[PDB]
Design an enzyme around this catalytic site. Structure first.
Site, PDB file in Angstrom:
ATOM      1  N   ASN A 128      -6.439  -3.602  -5.766  1.00 15.46           N
ATOM      2  CA  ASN A 128      -7.628  -3.172  -6.537  1.00 15.46           C
ATOM      3  C   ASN A 128      -7.313  -2.108  -7.579  1.00 15.46           C
ATOM      4  OD1 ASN A 128      -7.426  -2.469  -3.698  1.00 15.46           O
ATOM      5  ND2 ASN A 128      -8.851  -0.802  -4.134  1.00 15.46           N
ATOM      6  N   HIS A 129      -6.415  -1.195  -7.202  1.00 13.83           N
ATOM      7  CA  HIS A 129      -6.045  -0.052  -8.018  1.00 13.83           C
ATOM      8  C   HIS A 129      -5.100  -0.408  -9.143  1.00 13.83           C
ATOM      9  CE1 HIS A 129      -8.039   2.758  -5.476  1.00 13.83           C
ATOM     10  NE2 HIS A 129      -7.267   2.514  -4.426  1.00 13.83           N
ATOM     11  N   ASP A 175      -1.368  -2.623  -4.227  1.00 12.34           N
ATOM     12  CA  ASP A 175      -1.665  -1.198  -4.179  1.00 12.34           C
ATOM     13  C   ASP A 175      -0.376  -0.407  -4.061  1.00 12.34           C
ATOM     14  OD1 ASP A 175      -4.752  -0.482  -2.355  1.00 12.34           O
ATOM     15  OD2 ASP A 175      -4.333  -0.737  -4.520  1.00 12.34           O
ATOM     16  N   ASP A 231       0.764  -1.230   0.000  1.00 11.21           N
ATOM     17  CA  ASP A 231       0.000   0.000   0.000  1.00 11.21           C
ATOM     18  C   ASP A 231       0.810   1.305   0.000  1.00 11.21           C
ATOM     19  OD1 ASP A 231      -1.627  -2.078   2.103  1.00 11.21           O
ATOM     20  OD2 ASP A 231      -2.784  -1.053   0.491  1.00 11.21           O
ATOM     21  N   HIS A 254      -3.903  -4.056   2.012  1.00 15.90           N
ATOM     22  CA  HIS A 254      -5.243  -3.486   1.792  1.00 15.90           C
ATOM     23  C   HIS A 254      -5.872  -2.975   3.080  1.00 15.90           C
ATOM     24  CE1 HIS A 254      -9.073  -2.763  -0.378  1.00 15.90           C
ATOM     25  NE2 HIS A 254      -9.626  -3.130   0.754  1.00 15.90           N
ATOM     26  N   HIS A 284      -4.926  -0.228   5.702  1.00 11.38           N
ATOM     27  CA  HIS A 284      -4.018   0.888   5.920  1.00 11.38           C
ATOM     28  C   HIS A 284      -3.780   1.080   7.411  1.00 11.38           C
ATOM     29  CE1 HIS A 284      -5.556   2.505   1.816  1.00 11.38           C
ATOM     30  NE2 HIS A 284      -4.461   1.779   1.641  1.00 11.38           N
ATOM     31  N   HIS A 322      -4.253  -9.370  -1.308  1.00 13.38           N
ATOM     32  CA  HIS A 322      -4.706  -8.010  -1.165  1.00 13.38           C
ATOM     33  C   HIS A 322      -6.199  -8.125  -1.091  1.00 13.38           C
ATOM     34  CE1 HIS A 322      -4.088  -3.665  -1.376  1.00 13.38           C
ATOM     35  NE2 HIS A 322      -5.186  -3.595  -2.103  1.00 13.38           N
ATOM     36  N   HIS A 331       0.370   3.691  -2.799  1.00 13.24           N
ATOM     37  CA  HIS A 331      -0.493   4.624  -3.487  1.00 13.24           C
ATOM     38  C   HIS A 331       0.269   5.714  -4.212  1.00 13.24           C
ATOM     39  CE1 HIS A 331      -4.323   3.016  -1.853  1.00 13.24           C
ATOM     40  NE2 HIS A 331      -3.506   2.587  -0.903  1.00 13.24           N
TER      41      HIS A 331
END
Ligand code: MN
Ligand code: MN
Length: 316
Positions: free
Chosen positions: A88-89, A53, A12, A190, A192, A162, A14
């Protein structure tokens, strides 16, 4: 310290996420990243486990993409094997559209099944898969039984996923704690927030996000720490005691609650103490708003709430 075998569990990041549409927020994300990478390049773990992610979008800002290749290229030149699962992203939405992970193909191995790494020296078993939607839950059940079967005759077995689990993300979640097999180590992502706790004959891990992407991750940040977890697996069994969780410094948020003079002076002393311009959140009584407007320049942004209500509720 250590060791004989070692590896990192991060998740994660991002990359390319421009919070509050702040040019300057975008940057901080890449910095916490560029930071994490620097630690890991020191620590030289024998392998890295990215629970997904990495990015924040199927079409990231060019710089996020470059930073992420440059990073993992470095990791891979420094003989560190990386496994990453798709979050997911990073999942394509139209047929034929390609993840942005498919740019790290040369520095990174994308997990979507089973593999075994000889390391130096020994043998361990990775399995993991991408991000399946709540709906494709059944699809996955099979995916795990299958995984479990090929994982049994294997002493040290690692799982990468994830997804939102059920003891950990009450709603919405895509898997149940009772949905998944028994592995040495559960390198998930996933969630945070840092979540290391033993589990079914082994240890579960939630690397957590590498920077306050909410809107929540405040106290969680300061009490525990954001960043990655450093595992080692040099030794047979594994308890919460052979997982050295690394912390990673980031933009300072301060929580304010401004309702009297006491607390207006409090909120300033906190903002002085701030090494860097901070993001500030919480509540500020309407009546003190413009007095506090006074520190516009010592403050990155004011995402505190303006409270027009008057409260009597004292303390006991
Ligand atoms: Mn995430
Ligand atoms: Mn996610």
């Amino acid at each position: 310290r250590g060791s004989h075998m070692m590896f990192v569990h991060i998740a994660d990041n991002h990359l390319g996420y421009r919070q509050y549409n702040l040019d300057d927020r975008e940057k901080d994300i890449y910095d916490s990243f560029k930071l994490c990478i620097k630690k890991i390049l020191e620590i030289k773990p024998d392998v890295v486990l990215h629970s997904g992610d990495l990015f924040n979008d199927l079409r990231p800002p060019v710089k996020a993409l470059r930073i992420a290749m440059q990073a993992f290229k470095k990791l891979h030149e420094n003989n560190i094997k990386v496994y990453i699962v798709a979050g997911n992203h990073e999942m394509p939405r139209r047929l034929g559209e390609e993840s942005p992970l498919a740019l790290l193909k040369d520095y990174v191995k994308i997990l979507d099944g089973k593999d075994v790494i000889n390391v130096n020296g020994e043998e361990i078993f990775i399995c993991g898969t991408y991000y399946h939607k709540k709906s494709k839950r059944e699809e996955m059940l099979d995916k795990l039984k299958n995984f479990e079967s090929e994982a049994k005759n294997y002493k040290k077995k690692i799982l990468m996923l994830h997804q939102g689990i059920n003891p950990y993300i009450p709603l919405d979640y895509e898997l149940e704690h009772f949905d998944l097999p028994k592995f040495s180590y559960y390198a998930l992502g996933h969630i945070h927030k840092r979540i290391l706790e033993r589990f079914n004959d082994g240890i579960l891990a939630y690397s957590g996000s590498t920077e306050i992407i909410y809107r929540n991750e405040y106290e969680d940040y300061k009490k525990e720490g954001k960043g990655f977890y450093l595992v080692d697996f040099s030794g047979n069994d594994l308890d919460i005691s052979d997982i050295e969780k690394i912390d990673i410094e980031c933009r300072e948020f301060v929580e304010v609650n401004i309702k009297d003079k006491k607390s207006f002076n409090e909120a300033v002393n906190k903002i002085e103490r701030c090494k860097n311009k901070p993001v500030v959140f919480g509540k500020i009584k309407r009546e003190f708003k413009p007095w506090f407007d006074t520190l516009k320049d010592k403050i990155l942004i004011n995402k505190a709430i303006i409270v027009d209500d008057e409260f009597i509720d004292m303390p006991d």
